[PDB]
């Protein structure tokens, strides 16, 4: 379209690493400046 490319987002292989660590019964969580959780799965894997 003749535009400049936009800002990138989280790579998919990092999402795979988080899931594979959860299969090992390890709780890995991404946090923000205030130590609050950040959802990197767009809410697609949260049980409502």
């Amino acid at each position: 379209k003749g535009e400049d490319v936009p800002e990138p987002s989280v790579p998919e292989s990092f999402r795979v690493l988080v899931k594979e660590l959860q299969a090992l019964a390890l709780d890995v969580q991404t946090l923000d400046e205030k130590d609050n959780p950040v959802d990197i799965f767009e809410g697609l894997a949260s049980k409502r």
Partner: protein, 53 residues
């Protein structure tokens, strides 16, 4: 933790080195909030099927 702190005052170098190594694991559990009995599994997680296609 209170018992291991008392053994930390022993004259022997070996006793103080052994009590420190046990205390380090105890301190990590107390500060983190994890429970020691979580190291034995009761429910096994299953990977999503698309990552084991």
């Amino acid at each position: 933790e209170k018992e291991l702190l008392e053994e930390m005052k022993h004259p022997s170098r070996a006793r103080r080195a052994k009590a420190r190594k046990r205390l380090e694991v105890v301190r990590a559990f107390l500060d983190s909030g994890n429970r020691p009995e979580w190291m034995i599994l009761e429910a096994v997680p299953v990977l999503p099927p698309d990552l084991r296609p």
